[PDB]
Amino acid sequence: PPTKPTKPGDNATPEKLAKFQADLAKFQKDLADF
């Protein structure tokens, strides 16, 4: 099962938050396979 990361709290800084959304795109892509 595709394990997703948790919602950024203090690490929700704009630049890293964007990376997070990008990594979630990979998760959502793989989730579609699951």
Q: Which two tokens stand for residue 26?
A: 């990979």
Helix then strand then coil, in percent of the chain rounded to 5, is 60, 0, 40
CB 2 within 8 Å of CB 31: yes
The DSSP call for residue 6 is P
Residue 8: strand, helix, or coil: coil
Residue 29: strand, helix, or coil: helix
Residue with tokens 């396979």, as numbered in its chain: 33
Residue type, 22: A
Task: Please compute Rg for the chain using Cα positions.
Answer: 10
Residue with tokens 């990008």, as numbered in its chain: 22
Residue type, 5: P
Residue with tokens 């890293």, as numbered in its chain: 16
